[PDB]
Design a protein around this ligand. Structure first.
Ligand SMILES: OC[C@@H]1O[C@H](O)[C@H](O)[C@H]1O
Ligand SMILES: OC[C@@H]1O[C@H](O)[C@H](O)[C@H]1O
Ligand SMILES: O[C@@H]1[C@@H](O)[C@@H](O)OC[C@H]1O
Ligand SMILES: O[C@@H]1[C@@H](O)[C@@H](O)OC[C@H]1O
Ligand SMILES: O[C@@H]1[C@@H](O)[C@H](O)OC[C@H]1O
Ligand SMILES: O[C@@H]1[C@@H](O)[C@H](O)OC[C@H]1O
Ligand SMILES: O[C@@H]1[C@@H](O)[C@H](O)OC[C@H]1O
Ligand SMILES: O[C@@H]1[C@@H](O)[C@H](O)OC[C@H]1O
Ligand SMILES: [Ca+2]
Ligand SMILES: [Ca+2]
Lengths: 504, 504
């Protein structure tokens, strides 16, 4: 039996996994998007269902001034004696913290801030003797030696017990990070990432008889990498290990699916799965001797996407994210029941600090995305539409607006410093359907006059100008609904009737 | 004593070196640019002077349909018994060939085509017993096994002697290439590149008692790489070894100087230098145990850029290149003596097949480039100016043109599918000076009214939107003079009085 990588497609980086009984839970990083830290459930490690998010209240998730280069970095999920612990860094705050839950169907606790614990990629390990360890990276603010640092932790207080110790510098790759500590068959294993989360990414491992070392580097490090290969999966690493309930061992990790030359990726880093074998001499081997594939052998794992939101519910679906903390008063499912009402502010998609926007990840190279908008702009600056969005300097949008007192449909692009109106046509109806067809190379932007059903191709745009390599940051493309007054508050409401996401 | 890498700055990839007495000669790849294969001279390996080019006649260099993804790939330079041999691939023709010279101050021979020898990166080795070997890569057209292939060669006939043999697959990195064979202290060394010429690039070496193997992989391969590091020099490899006349050993190779995040480079791949040490057990060590730096120890090498062309000469300087084979009738230094006259055709900078353009490499992150143009366009399509050019889809230009019968100075950009006029101002003089200030992050485009000396900032543009990572291909930015009729022949001549390139 076979499965395909990635197992969670689209922008789902830094996967951390946690087993409870015969069920599995997984979390990913979310940067500037709100709510933060998607959480998934699976029974077979292959098929994952999003249960919701971990950070859903402003007290848990302060994203003022966050961008796709900041906000929430790698989260780690652990379970002990009926309690889930989620530990992560808000890089904008420069703070590490824990939230807790006894029930993933309910909400998580207020943050327990870990004072004086710096760096990114905090992790927790519950040792068999009852001791709890926090492991993490060098603190940049301080200017510490690159490497992996560890201490005992008191979980109630969120405070370190005893001394913080450097435990391993790694094999010598850049950015030693993503540390997780495990104990298997009497050995402590320290699993890390090196090389940076781009084309040099790799997984390395060390072991010791003691939780604080000394750690011996695995003689066949790195144990997983696609560096220096032209494989369709690239930038592989940031791994977390699980033992399935049949006793077999597996790792989750992220990778990219770049296209073009030099390689460029626009779907973000995506969650992948590979089996682990243990050597006779007590080392883990990931995948096919340190390499993985798109099609993989499922071993004994039990093998087994059209999304349509008509805005009938007064609760937002779990597909939606906002750019930073939403200004709640600017979105309404109740103002006009069965529609989403959005109120544009002075902020545009070129601005980092909460523009009026709600969006969902692009999770497929080939898909069709559409929405119906009612919008009657009162003034020339006023605009609402559908965006393909990577960050504040890299986005395309098809929108209704006004120019010299005439309503126009426009295709607009921001790429770096370039802000261009690509095409503009007069439009004569109160509602419009926007439709975007995505393929690996380009987006095609069309609009439909709803009453006639007549379709019009407005223009196209390249996927590669939205790629991470071009745009910067750590994220993937989103499709979003937005409104703006382009420097002034928008005086006209935007009403979106529905949103459809149809993969090939 | 110290030197700085790169030793030849700007677009100078795939360096191959050749010693004759106490003097040294070096060649680099040139892709679609004409003339092709720059050749340099040095006495100390650090300071290189361009002597000219190897491929200067249309018979030697057929570039119709060549782009920055094709044309001339890696060249290798060798010397034997008073004759220089340059061997390379024209990827557009899909042909390998040799040109010969007994005097680098004169021209090279007609091509000797090596029939049936495919792949890229051909190399020559003159064995101590008089035998001559050609070494190269797998032939893609055929669909051969990746690896390094070798045969004996008859140099007069350009034909293989005996059998072509696979000699090494490399260590397992992608694209095993750049092979060179050497014989040192009774061992044959086969030096190659693996990992691709991007962030996974590395140098590996194998040895044998016999020229055709079996080859043993060096136990500490790779012997040079910056993969998985955040060093300012990246993508290092494609090395060629020389023994200096004091007996010390050195390698030349290329690397990039990327900026931003993810890393992006716009100066092309640049030629670097590092020392070699030989181990007691007979293996070469490059640089500081397989890593190199911007500042390097010069050992015993004897340690030791404003370019102004006023077009007084009726011969083009060695700084200038054209896009493919120039249409000679469209450039003149004699029509108006002391000026360069250019005649624009229907072809624009967006077209691959010889637009009217002459250009020189950007060789510094910080520099000021300028020219004076006399241009009186007769029609709206007609345009001449100064370009910052990476390839046909990635270039910025400041130019004089006509719109609705008014002369305007414009800043124009092509980035992927985006073609935009960024700024446009009416202009009232027959001549104009264009001035571009480059820094690592951006180009600033100004014009000067020559008689008044008044300067006007027209706009700016990002370096990263011209980077190789964004644009594609294998080259670096050029600054160019150009003219076009934008779909029609230009009916007005363009006269450029001078060109100045002033590094910081
Ligand atoms: O995803 C953001 C950062 O990149 C690396 O994957 C690191 O482990 C993580 O915190
Ligand atoms: O520069 C073009 C090609 O890239 C690699 O450096 C290869 O060796 C060369 O022929
Ligand atoms: O892997 C990442 C690295 O490449 C850098 O860009 O930022 C922090 C690290 O997590
Ligand atoms: O190293 C190069 C590789 O990465 C690819 O892009 O093209 C041919 C090779 O020479
Ligand atoms: O912090 C609280 C959390 O502990 C509980 O689970 O749900 C409600 C929250 O306010
Ligand atoms: O009994 C458990 C079994 O399900 C599996 O082997 O994983 C660990 C064991 O504790
Ligand atoms: O091919 C000729 C070359 O061999 C000679 O060196 O210079 C003139 C060329 O025409
Ligand atoms: O005599 C030569 C010397 O200059 C140097 O050691 O390089 C090789 C020798 O042949
Ligand atoms: Ca509805
Ligand atoms: Ca002159």
């Amino acid at each position: 039996m076979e499965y395909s990588n990635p197992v969670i497609k689209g922008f789902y980086p830094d996967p951390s996994i946690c087993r409870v009984g015969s069920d599995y839970y997984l979390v990913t990083s979310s940067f500037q998007y709100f709510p933060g830290v998607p959480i998934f459930h699976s029974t077979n490690l292959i098929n994952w269902n999003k249960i919701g998010y971990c950070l859903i209240r402003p007290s848990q998730l302060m994203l003022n001034n966050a961008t796709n280069r900041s906000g929430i970095f790698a989260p780690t999920l652990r379970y002990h004696e009926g309690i889930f612990y989620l530990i992560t860094t808000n890089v904008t705050l420069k703070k590490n913290f824990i939230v807790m839950s006894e029930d993933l169907q309910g909400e998580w606790s207020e943050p327990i801030w870990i004072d004086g614990w710096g760096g990114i990629d905090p992790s927790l390990f519950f040792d068999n003797d009852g001791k709890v360890y926090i492991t993490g990276t060098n603190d940049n603010a301080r200017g510490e030696e690159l490497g992996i640092y560890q201490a005992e932790i008191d979980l109630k207080k969120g405070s370190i017990i005893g001394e913080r110790k450097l435990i391993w510098k790694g094999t010598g790759g850049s950015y030693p990070e993503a540390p997780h500590l495990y104990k298997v068959n009497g050995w402590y294993y320290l699993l890390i990432a090196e090389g940076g989360t781009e084309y040099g990414h790799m997984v390395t491992v060390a072991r010791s008889k003691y939780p604080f070392g000394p750690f011996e580097s695995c003689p066949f490090n790195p144990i997983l990498t696609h560096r220096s290969t032209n494989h369709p999966l690239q930038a592989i690493g940031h791994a977390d290990i699980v033992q399935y309930h049949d006793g077999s061992w597996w790792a989750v990790f992220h990778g990219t699916r770049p296209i073009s030359y030099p390689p460029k990726h626009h779907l973000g880093r995506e969650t992948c799965l590979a089996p682990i074998k243990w050597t006779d001499d007590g080392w883990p081997i990931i995948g096919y001797n340190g390499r993985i594939d798109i099609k993989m052998d499922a071993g004994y794992l039990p093998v087994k996407e059209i999304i349509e939101d008509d805005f009938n519910s007064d609760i937002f679906s779990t597909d939606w994210n906002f750019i930073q903390n939403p200004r709640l008063e600017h979105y309404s499912l109740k103002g006009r029941p069965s529609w989403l009402k959005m109120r544009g502010t002075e902020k545009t998609l070129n601005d980092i600090n909460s523009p009026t926007f709600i969006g969902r990840r692009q999770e497929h190279f080939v898909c069709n995305v559409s929405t119906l908008l009612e919008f009657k702009p009162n003034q020339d600056n006023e605009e609402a539409g559908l965006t393909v969005y990577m960050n504040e300097k890299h986005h395309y949008e098809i929108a209704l607006t006004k120019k010299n007192g005439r309503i126009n449909v426009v295709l607009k692009k921001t790429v770096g410093d370039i802000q261009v109106v690509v095409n503009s046509l007069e439009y004569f109806s109160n509602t419009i359907i926007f439709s975007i067809q995505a393929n690996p190379e380009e987006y095609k932007f069309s609009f439909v006059d709803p009453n006639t059903g007549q379709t019009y191709l407005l223009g196209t745009g390249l996927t590669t100008l939205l790629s991470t390599e071009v745009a910067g940051g750590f994220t993937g493309v989103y499709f979003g609904l937005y409104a703006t007054g382009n420097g002034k508050v928008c005086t006209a409401p935007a009403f979106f009737d529905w949103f459809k996401y149809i993969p090939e």
